[PDB]
Amino acid sequence: KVNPDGSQVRLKDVADVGLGGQDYSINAQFNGSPASGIAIKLATGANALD
Amino acid sequence: DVSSAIQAQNVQISSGQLGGLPAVKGQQLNATIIGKTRLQTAEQFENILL
């Protein structure tokens, strides 16, 4: 906004604007060190091994 | 006017979460906050300021 006299307000000084994460709730790690993984399911139809 | 009134006065308060992720070191208590649902009674309706 642009309250009466001087200039205008940008977003930076109303808030922090960082490239964060869509959803922080689910987190995972492998052995110790942090990781991220995708856990696949097998479509009703197809062959496990293949 | 009445339509608009009811639309602003018979809504669900969306409600967030106390200690939502990401949270600051400590947090400890993570609990959902429930707001108000909606009017139920015929009275609740007869109310609502116009």
Stated length of chain B = 50
Contact B10, B50 (CB under 8 A): no
B22 touches chain A (CB under 8 A): yes
Residue in B15, B14, B18 with CA at minimum distance from that of residue B30: B18
3-state SS string for chain A:
CCCCCCCCCCCCCCCCCCCCCCCCCCCEECCCCEECCCCCCCCCCCCCCC
B24 touches chain A (CB under 8 A): no
Q: How far is CA A8 from the centre of its chain?
A: 31
For B22, the token pair is 């990401």
Q: Which of B17, B21, B24, B27 to mutate to test the interface with A (most CBs of A within 10 A)?
A: B21
Experimental method: X-ray
- What is the C-alpha separation between A24 and A16, in angstroms, rounded? 17
Contact A48, A40 (CB under 8 A): no
Q: In chain B, what residues touch A24 (CB-CB under 8 Å)?
A: 21-22
Q: What resolution does the deposited structure have, in angstroms? A: 3.2
